[PDB]
Amino acid sequence: GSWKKFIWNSEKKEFLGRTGGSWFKILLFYVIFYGCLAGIFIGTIQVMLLTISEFKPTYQDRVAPPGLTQIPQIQKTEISFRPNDPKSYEAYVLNIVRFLEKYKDSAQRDDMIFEDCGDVPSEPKERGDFNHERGERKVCRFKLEWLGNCSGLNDETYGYKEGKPCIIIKLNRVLGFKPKPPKNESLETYPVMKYNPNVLPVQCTGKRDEDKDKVGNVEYFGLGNSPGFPLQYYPYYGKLLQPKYLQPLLAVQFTNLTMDTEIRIECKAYGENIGYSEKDRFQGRFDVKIEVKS
Amino acid sequence: RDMDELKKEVSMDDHKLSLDELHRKYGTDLSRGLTSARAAEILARDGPNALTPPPTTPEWIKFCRQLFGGFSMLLWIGAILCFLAYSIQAATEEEPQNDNLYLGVVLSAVVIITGCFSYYQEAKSSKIMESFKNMVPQQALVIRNGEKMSINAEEVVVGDLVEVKGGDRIPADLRIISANGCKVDNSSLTGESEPQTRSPDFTNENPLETRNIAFFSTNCVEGTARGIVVYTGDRTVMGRIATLASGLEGGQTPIAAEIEHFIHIITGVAVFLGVSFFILSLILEYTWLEAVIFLIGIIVANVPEGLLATVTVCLTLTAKRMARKNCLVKNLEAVETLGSTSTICSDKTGTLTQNRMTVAHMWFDNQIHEADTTENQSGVSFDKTSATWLALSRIAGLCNRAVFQANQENLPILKRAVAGDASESALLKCIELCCGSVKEMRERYAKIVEIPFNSTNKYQLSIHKNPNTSEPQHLLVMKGAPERILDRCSSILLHGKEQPLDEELKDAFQNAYLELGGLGERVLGFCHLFLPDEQFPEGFQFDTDDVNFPIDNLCFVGLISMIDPPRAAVPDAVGKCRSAGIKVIMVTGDHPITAKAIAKGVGIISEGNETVEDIAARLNIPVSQVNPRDAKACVVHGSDLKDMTSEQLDDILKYHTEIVFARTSPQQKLIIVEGCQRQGAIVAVTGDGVNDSPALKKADIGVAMGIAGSDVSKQAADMILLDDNFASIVTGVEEGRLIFDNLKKSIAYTLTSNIPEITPFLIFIIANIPLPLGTVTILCIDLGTDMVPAISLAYEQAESDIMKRQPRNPKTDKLVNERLISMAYGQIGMIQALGGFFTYFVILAENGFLPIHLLGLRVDWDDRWINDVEDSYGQQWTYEQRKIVEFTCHTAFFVSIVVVQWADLVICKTRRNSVFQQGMKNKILIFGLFEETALAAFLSYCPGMGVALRMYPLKPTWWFCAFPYSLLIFVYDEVRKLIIRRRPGGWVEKETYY
Amino acid sequence: DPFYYDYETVRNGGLIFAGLAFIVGLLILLSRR
Ligand SMILES: CCCCCCCCCCCCCCCCCC(=O)OC[C@H](COP(=O)([O-])OCC[N+](C)(C)C)OC(=O)CCCCCCCCCCCCCCCCC
Numbered sequence A: 001g002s003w004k005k006f007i008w009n010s011e012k013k014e015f016l017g018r019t020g021g022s023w024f025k026i027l028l029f030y031v032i033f034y035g036c037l038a039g040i041f042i043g044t045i046q047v048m049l050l051t052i053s054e055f056k057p058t059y060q061d062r063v064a065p066p067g068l069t070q071i072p073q074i075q076k077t078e079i080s081f082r083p084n085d086p087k088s089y090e091a092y093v094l095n096i097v098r099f100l101e102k103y104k105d106s107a108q109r110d111d112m113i114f115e116d117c118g119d120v121p122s123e124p125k126e127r128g129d130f131n132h133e134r135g136e137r138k139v140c141r142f143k144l145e146w147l148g149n150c151s152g153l154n155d156e157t158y159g160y161k162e163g164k165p166c167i168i169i170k171l172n173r174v175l176g177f178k179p180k181p182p183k184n185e186s187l188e189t190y191p192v193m194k195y196n197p198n199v200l201p202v203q204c205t206g207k208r209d210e211d212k213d214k215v216g217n218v219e220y221f222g223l224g225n226s227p228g229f230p231l232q233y234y235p236y237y238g239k240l241l242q243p244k245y246l247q248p249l250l251a252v253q254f255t256n257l258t259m260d261t262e263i264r265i266e267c268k269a270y271g272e273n274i275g276y277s278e279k280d281r282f283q284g285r286f287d288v289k290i291e292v293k294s
Numbered sequence B: 001r002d003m004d005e006l007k008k009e010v011s012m013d014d015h016k017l018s019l020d021e022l023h024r025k026y027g028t029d030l031s032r033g034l035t036s037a038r039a040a041e042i043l044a045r046d047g048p049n050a051l052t053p054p055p056t057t058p059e060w061i062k063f064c065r066q067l068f069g070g071f072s073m074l075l076w077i078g079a080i081l082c083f084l085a086y087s088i089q090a091a092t093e094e095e096p097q098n099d100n101l102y103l104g105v106v107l108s109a110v111v112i113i114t115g116c117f118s119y120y121q122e123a124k125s126s127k128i129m130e131s132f133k134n135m136v137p138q139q140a141l142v143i144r145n146g147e148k149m150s151i152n153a154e155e156v157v158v159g160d161l162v163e164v165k166g167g168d169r170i171p172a173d174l175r176i177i178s179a180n181g182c183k184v185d186n187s188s189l190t191g192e193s194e195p196q197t198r199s200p201d202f203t204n205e206n207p208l209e210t211r212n213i214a215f216f217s218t219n220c221v222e223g224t225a226r227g228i229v230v231y232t233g234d235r236t237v238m239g240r241i242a243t244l245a246s247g248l249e250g251g252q253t254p255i256a257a258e259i260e261h262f263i264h265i266i267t268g269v270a271v272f273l274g275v276s277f278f279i280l281s282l283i284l285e286y287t288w289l290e291a292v293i294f295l296i297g298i299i300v301a302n303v304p305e306g307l308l309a310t311v312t313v314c315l316t317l318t319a320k321r322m323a324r325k326n327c328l329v330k331n332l333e334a335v336e337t338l339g340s341t342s343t344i345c346s347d348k349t350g351t352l353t354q355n356r357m358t359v360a361h362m363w364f365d366n367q368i369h370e371a372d373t374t375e376n377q378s379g380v381s382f383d384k385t386s387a388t389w390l391a392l393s394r395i396a397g398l399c400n401r402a403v404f405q406a407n408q409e410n411l412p413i414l415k416r417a418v419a420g421d422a423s424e425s426a427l428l429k430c431i432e433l434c435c436g437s438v439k440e441m442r443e444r445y446a447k448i449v450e451i452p453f454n455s456t457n458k459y460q461l462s463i464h465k466n467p468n469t470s471e472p473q474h475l476l477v478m479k480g481a482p483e484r485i486l487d488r489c490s491s492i493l494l495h496g497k498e499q500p501l502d503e504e505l506k507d508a509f510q511n512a513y514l515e516l517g518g519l520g521e522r523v524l525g526f527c528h529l530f531l532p533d534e535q536f537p538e539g540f541q542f543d544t545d546d547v548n549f550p551i552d553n554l555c556f557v558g559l560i561s562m563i564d565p566p567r568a569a570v571p572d573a574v575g576k577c578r579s580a581g582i583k584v585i586m587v588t589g590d591h592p593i594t595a596k597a598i599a600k601g602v603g604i605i606s607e608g609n610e611t612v613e614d615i616a617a618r619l620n621i622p623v624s625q626v627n628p629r630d631a632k633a634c635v636v637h638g639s640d641l642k643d644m645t646s647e648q649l650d651d652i653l654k655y656h657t658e659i660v661f662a663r664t665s666p667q668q669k670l671i672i673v674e675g676c677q678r679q680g681a682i683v684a685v686t687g688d689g690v691n692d693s694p695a696l697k698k699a700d701i702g703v704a705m706g707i708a709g710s711d712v713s714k715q716a717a718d719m720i721l722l723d724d725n726f727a728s729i730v731t732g733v734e735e736g737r738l739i740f741d742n743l744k745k746s747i748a749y750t751l752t753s754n755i756p757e758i759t760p761f762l763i764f765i766i767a768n769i770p771l772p773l774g775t776v777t778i779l780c781i782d783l784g785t786d787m788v789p790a791i792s793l794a795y796e797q798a799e800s801d802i803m804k805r806q807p808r809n810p811k812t813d814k815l816v817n818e819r820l821i822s823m824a825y826g827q828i829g830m831i832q833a834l835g836g837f838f839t840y841f842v843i844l845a846e847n848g849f850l851p852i853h854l855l856g857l858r859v860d861w862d863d864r865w866i867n868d869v870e871d872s873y874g875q876q877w878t879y880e881q882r883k884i885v886e887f888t889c890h891t892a893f894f895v896s897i898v899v900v901q902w903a904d905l906v907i908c909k910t911r912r913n914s915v916f917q918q919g920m921k922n923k924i925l926i927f928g929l930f931e932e933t934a935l936a937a938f939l940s941y942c943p944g945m946g947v948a949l950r951m952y953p954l955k956p957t958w959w960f961c962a963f964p965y966s967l968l969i970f971v972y973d974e975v976r977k978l979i980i981r982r983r984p985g986g987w988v989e990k991e992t993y994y
Numbered sequence C: 001d002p003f004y005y006d007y008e009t010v011r012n013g014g015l016i017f018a019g020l021a022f023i024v025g026l027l028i029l030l031s032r033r
């Protein structure tokens, strides 16, 4: 039966229909076969990797307009806290503190790597070509003091203790990408802000019509006077040619929100290069929902 | 139990009685019958004279039983978990994501469609009792209240008196008391059309062989008779045969037992992979939504979704191939059964013979001439030149009471109906086909005085005028039984000359008679005399009550012999069946002399091999002084089956090789079929009549004869030979063995592609890598690109000559074994999986994700709210930007599986031979090869497919990433077949040959 | 422009191939009658 006949019929010394040598020979065949397949797989992977350039990817069409993100890494684009409760905004302030670690001036004091760049937004910096033909490149350095009233050299809660919260907006790193700000016809973009030919402009407004009258005043902090990304930093060369690269940031503070209402806010960059999408709700644009309970 | 009781002989003891015991056992006074006060009371006491159909299950129960057939259970589980995932998805936060709803709807529809396919394959419940209900008349002829009246035949009781005339059907079973010789036709019991003279006297202990029992469903075709009813309805002999044949179950076809073995194997592997990797997803702390999505993806990857529809379509193509050879196949699963058969239990009359008595041999002029007994005149003739041929043509054409019917002359000679008896129409058709018309000779030789066959004188005689130059002026001609004919003859006819009688010719005459009687054939002798004109003038008339013409006719013309001959194709077909390993057993209702002669003629009993009685006659020994293991052929009379035990029948079937059963009952052929089936055999049964209809129902496959077959046997059969060509049987064996070899290949083609469908989900949970393949693109592999290349393998030819092989063992020798599993899953499937993983790594490396960087990236990649994921070059990606790259990898994995299935289709055509020896002469294979790639390129490059299926366009150099893996598959299987061919019993043949 | 790929050319070439391969395979199948 299934007790003694099929498992361990021992008049011919067989376990599941096979002797000892009939087990050994098929196991040796299978380990040799799978070893040869693993060898062929590793060899074809290495011959494929010999076609890959280590300074620039082969295709860059799937990151072709970059994305816009904000630094308190939240879970459903929601920010909800009570300002007289130092446990509700703890994860927000801790995430902001862990991000701005490498922006402190005690981390940018090498001089063979960092360099004092300008103080006005300027033209992009071309450092040559992508081919190690000049080894490691230098990085313009970003002062934390330019994020004023949203840096840490003040109150250490970034505004969350006193009502008014603040977010840090950044653009996704794309290798070799230079953003083009919108050209002057004095009309083109929307609606009106202070035009600079060396700033990629960024605006944060209310989403619906009922949120435009409830978001209150908005403050921008960054390099310069006009709110956006300065173009000095922007030809990024990769983490092989530029480790310790610091991308420029833009701080946005909401000083006069209304209480006990979930407010929906859209932030958006404008350029000739910046594209949008109805399927990707983070391409060149993002949305956030802020509620301050009191 | 009760149908186990139905397989016994019928007990009467009515025929052993006399006119007094019947007067008190049934109360019927034998002259007046019954009054209606007693008859209408016994009718309510006992039951009507009718049959009743069995309980039949309706069509929707038999269809909704197909919706739980093994693979359908795992797919119902998958369809339930898809709706569970959708409800836990879109009723907590995400108001998008109707993806897991359509997937459940698709999986629910796949079960319904494959259930329709498996319902078409089902074995077609037919209506035997409805054709048993047509051999009953509508009117009986009863004698009640002292007179006669014609009532409905359903209102006959057990005991009243029936009167039958020639032309009626018989309403019940009758013990008869007065008949002036009516002849019934007992073909429903014995399969013989020769009529039996019924008589009111007891003649034999067995009630099926006695003269005083008329039976149900037969017909008395002469005279008249009066009988008393002994059985009505379900209690009659043929009613019990109908009950047995409609109560005999179907039985499981051998092809269905092969399907319900790999359903078990594949379900075991699928359930093990599904429930062992679902608890790993709970140890490593997934969420419930991700755990059930992983379970769905591992269930769909494991079920070969389109496989049972492929088997149904391949069997339908083979059945349509067989239908152009005039071989209609009713139940589809009986396509395979004729290939794996090991024992053919054939019927003799109507199946092996032509069921028409015709002239076999003659004995002109001290020499034996053989005729051509073939229905299409395939053989050659005998003689048409000598004078005694024209003389005996005259004699056999003029001493004949038979005649043609009402002008059906356009239909040819051997099939025209006659009006006389068959034994004389056998002479009439030979005279008509070999010497022109007979009516011209019958009018030119005018008849003056005749007297037909008197049953105590053994001849039939007539006087005919000769109108030509010979002029005996009323010549004499007669015919009769041979020894009583040469009792009274002294002049012999040799080439038209007269010679005297010496025993020089007479012991030669008895030599020819003994040799003709050793062929099982009916011989009779013919005579004539040239009358003189000393006592017999012109215009004289003879009278039929006295002697005034000579009854001492010194005549000697010759002997003519008759037989039921074999068909044209049966002697070659029996040899073809025996050369393929099939044991052919004859089972018949005829007497053993004609049975053994026919069985030696068709070749069931071969030369040299002879029975026990031939030994005891060759050595002049009593038969109980010779060892029964000496002979290898046996002829078992059916009356000795009655006292036989079930294990003596096993001895008969075990120790002999050429078996003949004779005088078999309708119930005893069922005993013989079950006795062959009991010691592990697949038994085909061929038949024509109603007395083979139980044995056609018990067998693995029943083959009925089309033209000459009864309406009952055409309902109890699985095949119908639509032109009565028995050599189609051999053809049905050959394409039975071929489709069983063509199925394996297609099954192997459909199993290999399972492996580059399962291993994407395993490496997803072992290595924590972004998921290389989705569930929709798994469904598009099998339900799409795999159907036509698997169906195309059913057109492959045989590699060797398959009719030299023995039949397959049912217990060993499976359809799917451990070697097909090892070859499909363990060897070719792993190369097919590495071919897809290489293409997966290529696209991610070319967009900036190097292969060492992808390990452990699964949680951040799947996160909807992390919109900066760093790649190997430092670029940051949003969530919808990298999902497009993932769906491109899904499309390319699909394309890679399509590319490796080209080489998989090419290596699966042959199992031992090469592609350079067999060729590429299969056009539907090349059509499948083209259309699979056409469908893949259409799905990849069509506009709008990124929404409906989440399929994306491929860049042109990504179509070539799986070419070295197809080349490896091809050269590996060619080298494997070379080692199989050059070492014909070694290790590679023991491990990798299916 | 490294941030642009022409997908319409590859799409048109794939659809031309998908039509031609199907017509050729059907001509191979329906050889005579
Ligand atoms: C691009 C490559 C194409 C070619 C690659 C294919 C090479 C291998 C051929 C395919 C089938 C596998 C055959 C190899 C083993 C055959 C051994 C043999 O000759 O049997 C006879 C020998 C001798 O026995 P035998 O043949 O005489 O049989 C005994 C019975 N009598 C005596 C009657 C014949 O078999 C053995 O004794 C033991 C065999 C088991 C050996 C243990 C495994 C060996 C490892 C080989 C694996 C090779 C696969 C590499 C994977 C390739 C990657 C694609």
Ligand SMILES: CC(C)CCC[C@H](C)[C@H]1CC[C@H]2[C@H]3CC=C4C[C@@H](OC(=O)CCC(=O)O)CC[C@@]4(C)[C@@H]3CC[C@@]12C
Residues within 6 Å of the ligand: A041, A042, A045, A046, A049, B759, B763, B767, B829, B830, B831, B833, B834, B837, B841, B851, B852, B855
């Ligand atoms: C039939 C089934 C079981 C086979 C499919 C399993 C795959 C072979 C698995 C095994 C581990 C996986 C991969 C994990 C990462 C490695 C890195 C790679 O080695 C390198 O990183 C090269 C870097 C260098 O050049 O130094 C070797 C192959 C590869 C892609 C593996 C390729 C095959 C994967 C998908």
Ligand SMILES: CC(C)CCC[C@H](C)[C@H]1CC[C@H]2[C@H]3CC=C4C[C@@H](OC(=O)CCC(=O)O)CC[C@@]4(C)[C@@H]3CC[C@@]12C
Residues within 6 Å of the ligand: B902, B903, B906, B915, B916, B917, B918, B919, B920, B921, B963, B966, B967, B970
């Ligand atoms: C992705 C690519 C690299 C793999 C595709 C594999 C092809 C299926 C290969 C396998 C062997 C090749 C061929 C090698 C030579 C034979 C001869 C031919 O034989 C004959 O028809 C001659 C007539 C006869 O011998 O009866 C059978 C098909 C054919 C073309 C083969 C058809 C399939 C080819 C092109």
Ligand SMILES: CC(C)CCC[C@H](C)[C@H]1CC[C@H]2[C@H]3CC=C4C[C@@H](OC(=O)CCC(=O)O)CC[C@@]4(C)[C@@H]3CC[C@@]12C
Residues within 6 Å of the ligand: A040, A043, A044, A047, A048, A051, A052, A058, B842, B846, B957, B958, B960, B961, B962, B964, B965, B968
């Ligand atoms: C040992 C056997 C099984 C394979 C060894 C011979 C193969 C013909 C080699 C030669 C180069 C290999 C590959 C090198 C590049 C890949 C990816 C792709 O080509 C590219 O790499 C272009 C990518 C780029 O331009 O960056 C398509 C062809 C393919 C699969 C090649 C297929 C053939 C490989 C495996």
Ligand SMILES: CC(C)CCC[C@H](C)[C@H]1CC[C@H]2[C@H]3CC=C4C[C@@H](OC(=O)CCC(=O)O)CC[C@@]4(C)[C@@H]3CC[C@@]12C
Residues within 6 Å of the ligand: B933, B937, B956, B957, B959, B960, C009, C010, C011, C012, C013, C014, C015, C017
């Ligand atoms: C090598 C043996 C096995 C025969 C190969 C059969 C394949 C179906 C072949 C036929 C032609 C090949 C390809 C030739 C070029 C086109 C490019 C592509 O269309 C275009 O990109 C056209 C635009 C352009 O090329 O500029 C659609 C698929 C593809 C890769 C073809 C897909 C099918 C390939 C791999």
Ligand SMILES: CC(C)CCC[C@H](C)[C@H]1CC[C@H]2[C@H]3CC=C4C[C@@H](OC(=O)CCC(=O)O)CC[C@]4(C)[C@@H]3CC[C@@]12C
Residues within 6 Å of the ligand: A033, A034, A035, A037, A038, A041, A042, B830, B852, B855
């Ligand atoms: C018979 C076949 C089907 C199974 C064997 C194929 C294996 C999947 C091969 C493919 C590549 C091999 C290995 C090559 C070296 C790497 C490095 C190893 O450690 C590292 O991650 C690199 C060190 C580090 O950066 O931490 C991770 C797995 C591993 C990919 C691979 C695991 C899988 C191996 C054994």
Ligand SMILES: CC(C)CCC[C@H](C)[C@H]1CC[C@H]2[C@H]3CC=C4C[C@@H](OC(=O)CCC(=O)O)CC[C@]4(C)[C@@H]3CC[C@@]12C
Residues within 6 Å of the ligand: A016, A017, A018, A026, B755, B758, B759, B818, B819, B821, B822, B825, B826, B827
């Ligand atoms: C990789 C995933 C998708 C599953 C596919 C892997 C194969 C199923 C593996 C599992 C273990 C392997 C083999 C391990 C050794 C046995 C010996 C042998 O089994 C027997 O014949 C003994 C019983 C008997 O002979 O009666 C053939 C099948 C075989 C099971 C296995 C066939 C399947 C192999 C190649």
Ligand SMILES: *[C@@H]1O[C@H](CO)[C@@H](O[C@@H]2O[C@H](CO)[C@@H](O)[C@H](O)[C@H]2NC(C)=O)[C@H](O)[C@H]1NC(C)=O
Residues within 6 Å of the ligand: A149, A219
């Ligand atoms: C940044 O925060 C400081 C708080 O220290 C704000 O400075 C105060 O602004 C109000 C209104 O103008 C004055 O009445 C106070 O005297 C200021 N205090 C000091 C110490 O300067 C400052 O306005 C904020 N910057 C903005 C909102 O742009």
Ligand SMILES: *[C@@H]1O[C@H](CO)[C@@H](O)[C@H](O)[C@H]1NC(C)=O
Residues within 6 Å of the ligand: A213, A214, A215, A216, A217, A256, A258
């Ligand atoms: C918020 O305060 C600013 C201060 O000038 C004022 O202009 C604005 O109207 C206020 N918004 C609301 C919604 O009260």
Ligand SMILES: [K+]
Residues within 6 Å of the ligand: B300, B301, B302, B303, B304, B305, B753, B754, B757, B782
């Ligand atoms: K599957």
Ligand SMILES: [K+]
Residues within 6 Å of the ligand: B696, B697, B698, B699, B700, B701, B702, B716, B717, B718
């Ligand atoms: K049957």
Ligand SMILES: [K+]
Residues within 6 Å of the ligand: B304, B305, B750, B751, B753, B754, B782, B786
């Ligand atoms: K499959």
Ligand SMILES: [Mg+2]
Residues within 6 Å of the ligand: B191, B347, B348, B349, B350, B351, B688, B689
């Ligand atoms: Mg018959």
